[PDB]
A paper describes a structure:
Here, we describe the crystal structures of the N-terminal RD and the C-terminal ED of the lantibiotic resistance-associated RR NsrR from S. agalactiae. The expression of the genes of this operon is induced by a TCS consisting of the HK NsrK and the RR NsrR. NsrR belongs to the OmpR/PhoB family of RRs.
The structure of NsrR-ED from S. agalactiae was determined using experimental phases from a single-wavelength anomalous dispersion dataset from the rectangular plate-shaped crystal derivatized with platinum at a resolution of 1.6 Å in space group P21212. The ED domain of NsrR consists of six β-strands and three α-helices in a β6-β7-β8-β9-α6-α7-α8-β10-β11 topology (the secondary structure elements are counted in continuation of those of the RD). The effector domain starts with a 4-stranded antiparallel β-sheet, followed by three α-helices and eventually ends in a C-terminal β-hairpin. The structure of NsrR-ED also contains such a wHTH motif built up by helices α7 and α8. The 16-residue long, solvent-exposed recognition helix α8 of NsrR-ED contains four positively charged residues that can potentially interact with DNA. These are Arg198, Arg200, Lys201, and Lys202. The rmsd between the three helices of the effector domain (including the two helices forming the wHTH motif) of PhoB and NsrR-ED is 1.6 Å over 47 Cα atoms, clearly indicating that NsrR belongs to the OmpR/PhoB family of RRs.
Numbering used by the authors:
A (entry chain A): 128 to 224
B (entry chain B): 127 to 224
Write the structure that this text describes.
């Protein structure tokens, strides 16, 4: 499993912490997985798309945009507010502490 | 992907796809179907399915299993995966497959 800040992501797409859970689609799962594998690193949109293709998610950039938005809307409510937008660059997974 | 049966493939992330159609399974639905896919053409009792779920990080009870099994079948039967058979009082059976 992938872990970050007390959250665990399972291969089937369960993200959980404490008594909180959300279920991620395969695309949402693969996006979050890539970020969890690169904590505290700025991941450009191009790099994220490349890594998705590496993992058999052959989506385009608008699909990536939509799924990133859906992902964040899903996981912020259970306390995973660690994905930051870097305007014009990409994303950064980082825990303020 | 890798588990496959009856023209369908199940990815680890929960995508069940045929040549024509696909559906996304919840983690519990994924685990249930995976257990049946790993025991094809075998009768799997409810007790056995439950313990195997409990041996793979699930925490549901029998009544929540029934709801999940109904929800699973309502997701996958419409895309042509009608291979889960109920055996009254016994359990479930995954089975040219008919």
């Amino acid at each position: 499993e992938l872990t970050f800040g007390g959250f665990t992501l399972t291969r089937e797409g369960l993200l959980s912490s404490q008594d909180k859970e959300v279920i991620l689609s395969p695309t949402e799962n693969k996006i979050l997985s890539i970020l969890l594998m690169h904590p505290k690193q700025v991941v450009s949109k191009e790099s994220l798309l490349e890594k998705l293709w590496e993992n058999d998610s052959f989506i385009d950039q608008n699909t990536l945009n939509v799924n990133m938005t859906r992902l964040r809307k899903k996981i912020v409510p259970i306390g995973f507010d660690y994905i930051h937008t870097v305007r014009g660059v990409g994303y950064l997974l980082q825990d303020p502490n």
